[PDB]
Each structure stands twice: as C-alpha cells, then as structure tokens.
C-alpha cells in the first residue's frame, strides 16, 4: 500500500518554448468579432517551460511548486497520466488536494493525506467481477480531516495522437481548472499553433497550496516480480509544466465566438503597439504606446539624530486629572514617541482618530503635539469629536472641524469616584 519506487536513471531536465499556448477564456461571456484586452494570470508567449519524460527505465515525477498557477500539457496515447496532487507538505500534518480518474468517472477529495514517496496508481486483476481493477491505495496511506468530495465525468478522455492541456489556478478560495483536448500527430514536442482552454470546474477548497505532483500509471503485464523498485514499465507519455504570471493579453474573437488568436502586450514593443491600437494589424507610421520611467532602487530615510522619549507616561498615567472646564494642556516637543504601544494598550475604552490612523502614526513627524486631558462622564464621551454639540463641547472643550488627531478615553470609576 505504501511501497517505494526508486529506479535510478538520471537524465537532466529538458526545456522547451511555449510559442502560443495556455490561453483560456477569462470569463463565461460570449464575444464575437471583437478584440478584448484583459489582465489575468496567463502563460507568457515563448515561455521557458520544463520538459519531463516517462519513457524506457526513466521516470520523472518530482514535487514541483505552485507559485501562482500551472499550465500542464500532456502528449499521450494510452492515458498513462491519471491525475495530480496539490498541497504544501503532502503529509498528514496538512490538508492536500487529490484528483484521480477512474474509467468513466473522477474522484476528488480534500483530506489530510499521507503520501508515500513516488506514488502511483496500481492496476491488477481481481479474479472476481472478472475485470482489472484500479485500486488507488498506493498513492496515499491514510485520509484524515476530510472536508470535500466531488465526482464528475472524465477530465482526460481519448505516436501521440491527442493532446491534453490543463490550466490550474488557486484564486482566493476557488481552485479553477481550464482544459482542452486537441488531436495532433507531432511526436517530438509541443505543436506550434493556437488553441484556447475552456473552463471545467471551480472548486471551493479554500486551502493554501505551494507544491504539486503528478500521477501516472505503470504496466506489469508481461511479468510481475515482487513489489519493489523493479518489474514496472512506462509507455511513452511526456508532460510539460509552465508557471503563470499576471499578464495583460489582447484577445481576438471570431464570428462563432472562439478565440483563435491573442497577443501578449508586454512581449515586444510591436505587441505594445497592437494592444494600444486595439488591433492585430498596424498601419505604417509612428505610434505612441507607452511611457518610459526610471524606477527608484532604494528608499532614503533621514531624520535628526536625536535621542529622547516623549513623556506620555506623565500624561496618561498622571495621578490626578483636570476638570473639563479647566482642562489641562501638555505640549509635547523634541522627543520620539511610539503611538503603536499606546494603541496596543487595551486600557482605553475610546480610541477614535481623525484625519490620520494610529497604525500609520508612528512614522510621521510633527512640529508640536498637544495633549489635552480632563474628566467627563460616560454619556458625554461622544461629545469629544469635531462638529458635536452639548454642554461640554459648547461651554467646556470644543474641537475644530479640521481636527487632526486622536481622542482617547477610559473608564476611571475606580479612581475618580468617592463613596459619598
């Protein structure tokens, strides 16, 4: 159930260029005879993609990252690749996503799985039901913390006569999948051309994903030795992995509504021109398409090299306070203070700021700060605000309408109350 598989055939990883591949309908909207520019996680054109082989005993199924998305394409003839795995650590300590395809059905689970190294689906014969079953317990040992399950029609359906391209995304709480099946006769690498991927599902798993791995099948028909890193043979099935990035594309639409072409605006200045003019044809001439701007490299922070702390302690933790009609004023100057600690302290029942927030207050310099302190009762606390009316705001302490500061209050019944 958890056997290893450690055949040792080392070959360096190959790379290929994705000429124009990975385009998908960004929304479920119909468009015809129109050029549309949209920004979304796409596979840049002529992108440097890795290449992995599974031909004989060379097997390539490492754990790869899932930075922002994946363009997964597979040239197959025997449906050797059955599905994928997604997660952070792929062990029982964290939740992980699983996608596998049974004949004429799909299994999707979000459990805390404990995958063994070099997993795979096993195929055998059962001698009852008279049919070669496909038990999936080689992939994972245990399944804890299951929250989600889902079944649907096959995602993958039938040298390489067919091409299956997939697009995976992990947007805020939805795992989005775009797919396309294109038949081709090329056997070496990706066929240069164009084909858009239509959306398939949007799973609301709501988890954190950083790594992913692929699932393949093995053939052990001609003979079967004991379970070990041997006795397995993999047919010719290869797959390519590409990472998506936020990119602005210009999409074309035909009469039918299919894409059939697109343009990556930041590929080259000519693409910038095409996107600027909202056309795939540029007439002879000179066009203004963008603006060159040198960006800063680092920040420069300069302040007077003085060393002193503002005496907020003798203002807040003062032994006695003043009456509101004779409210005391303290002028704070020539010192350094941390308003973050003040805001952190939960001794205060009221902490409303105006024209500036306290979290963005311990990085702004002022010439003078005035600390006015007094004592009022509960229902009068709301009167200490710009544009308020009452006995206190009219006759005792009035705040301007352009006030820039914070109002702090706390219940002092334990200190300012007498039994009589």
């Amino acid at each position, epitope marked *: *159930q958890c056997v290893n598989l450690t055949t040792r055939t080392q070959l360096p990883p190959a790379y290929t260029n994705s000429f124009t591949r990975g385009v998908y309908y960004p929304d479920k909207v119909f468009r015809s005879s129109v050029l549309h520019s949209t920004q979304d996680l796409f596979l840049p054109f002529f992108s440097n993609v890795t290449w992995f082989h599974a031909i004989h005993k060379r097997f390539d199924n490492p754990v790869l990252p899932f930075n922002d998305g994946v363009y997964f394409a597979s040239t197959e003839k025997s449906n050797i690749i059955r599905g994928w795995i997604f997660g952070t650590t792929l062990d029982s300590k964290t939740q992980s996503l699983l996608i596998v395809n049974n004949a004429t059905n799909v299994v999707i689970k979000v459990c805390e799985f404990q995958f063994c190294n070099d997993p795979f689906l096993g195929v055998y014969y*059962h*001698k*009852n039901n008279k049919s070669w079953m496909e*038990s999936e*317990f080689r992939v994972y040992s245990s399944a804890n913390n299951c929250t989600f399950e889902y079944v649907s029609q096959p995602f993958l359906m039938d040298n390489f006569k067919n091409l299956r391209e997939f697009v995976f995304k992990n947007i805020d709480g939805y795992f989005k999948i775009y797919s396309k099946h294109t038949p081709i006769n090329l056997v070496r690498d990706l066929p240069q051309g164009f084909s858009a991927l239509e959306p398939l599902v949007d799973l609301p798993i709501g988890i954190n994903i950083t790594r992913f791995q692929t699932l393949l099948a093995l053939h052990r028909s001609y003979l079967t*030795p*004991g*379970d070990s890193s041997s006795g397995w043979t993999a047919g010719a099935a290869a797959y390519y992995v590409g990472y998506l990035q936020p990119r602005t594309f210009l999409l074309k639409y035909n009469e039918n509504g299919t894409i059939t072409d697109a343009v990556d605006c930041a590929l080259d200045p000519l693409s910038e021109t095409k996107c600027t003019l909202k056309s795939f044809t540029v007439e002879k001439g000179i066009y203004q398409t963008s603006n060159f701007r040198v960006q800063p490299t680092e920040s420069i922070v300069r302040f007077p090299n003085i060393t002193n702390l503002c005496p907020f302690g003798e203002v807040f933790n003062a032994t006695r306070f003043a009456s509101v009609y004779a409210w005391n004023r303290k002028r704070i100057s020539n010192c350094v203070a941390d308003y973050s600690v003040l805001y952190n302290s939960a001794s205060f029942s009221t902490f409303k700021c105006y024209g500036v927030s306290p979290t963005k207050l311990n990085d702004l310099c002022f010439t003078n700060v005035y600390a006015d302190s007094f004592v009022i009762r509960g229902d009068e606390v709301r009167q200490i605000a710009p544009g308020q009316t009452g006995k206190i705001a009219d006759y005792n302490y009035k705040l301007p309408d352009d006030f820039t500061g914070c109002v702090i209050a706390w219940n002092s019944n334990n200190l300012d109350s007498k039994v009589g």
Partner: antibody
Amino acid sequence: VQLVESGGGVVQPGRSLRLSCAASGFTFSSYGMHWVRQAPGKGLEWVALISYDGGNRYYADSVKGRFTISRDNSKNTLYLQMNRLRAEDTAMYYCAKDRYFMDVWGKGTTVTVSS
Amino acid sequence: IQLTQSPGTLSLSPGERATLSCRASQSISGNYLAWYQHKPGQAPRLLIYGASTRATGIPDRFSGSGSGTDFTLTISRLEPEDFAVYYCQQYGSSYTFGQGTKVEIK
C-alpha cells in the same frame, strides 16, 4: 493498526471451531492476511494465508484439507474454520497482516483441544 | 523449504556481539528472508526483511546479511531488551519459519 482475535476456547478432539479476526485502523481490503500458531513453549508455525481480495488461499501441509481461511472485506474480518481438530493443534493462534512477511500481529486466541 | 536455525540456545551478556544463523534446505528466492523477535507473552515483531533491510523503528545494532541458503542476523552490542527468541522466515516459496534461537543472559 489493530487486530483482535476471537473464538478461542476448549474443543473436543474431532470437533470444529471457527476463529475470527476483527481489523480496524488500516485499509483492510488491500492487505493479504495470514494465520500463525504457536504451541506452548514451541516455535512459530505458519497455518494459512488469504490474499487481499480473497481469490487465492494457501495452507500449511499439516492442516491441508481440515482448515479453511476466509475474509469479509465489507466487515473487516478474517475467519479461520478449523475442522477435525487434533490434540496437536492446541496452540495460540495469531492473526497477522501481510506487509510477504507479517508486520502487524494480533494478540492471539488460545485454542485448547481436549476432552 | 525447511529452515534450520543454529545455535539452539545462545548465552551472552549485555554489550557483547551475537551472531545468529539460518540455513534453508533450498535456495531462497529474491532474498526473501525475514527475522522476527518474540518475547514471552508477546506477539512476534518484525526486525529485518529483504535479508538486509531494517524494519521501521528497529535500532541500527541489528543487521542482516547472507544470500542463497545461508543467512546471518548480527546484533552488534546486545542490550537487555534484546534477550528473546529469534525466528527466521522465508517468503519466496510458501511461508515457513525456523524453529527459533533463544538468546538468554549468561
């Protein structure tokens, strides 16, 4: 990962006794299951094995024709039907999970063949 | 396949080196030879499989060697918990066990 045997006790020679093994904590239907016995103060003696799907069975030469091993994958149980018992079959019978070898062993059921 | 273990009883003290042998009447297929430990009142516990592969949780003082018909289990520095009966097993052609070696304190 836990195996609990049941059905032990005294049985008169010539009569029958059925042992059962209840499994939990693992994918029972994916492992072959063995029976092993140990006479008091003597060594281990393999008795029978049943494949994970119940299609293939094998028995020790000393019990061929008399013992039958079965399993129920829906109820996570393995059974050993012991017919025409002899005094020399008195032993502790262990239920054990295949890993091949056996890596998970039950505590065993004591079977005494006596009048 | 008959497995004959030797010696029948081994008497040693903690800290010493123990060598246990297992001989098969026929060559074992695929080095399918395992070793098991049994303490009184306890079920057996896997120590070694594949003739030389240590089972999970088994300390490195246990090591297995041999091929064909002749196999050895070595315990490099005996600990008190290591005094027990040891059985070898072949699993290449049916499933048969040795008669056991008792490792006792001298």
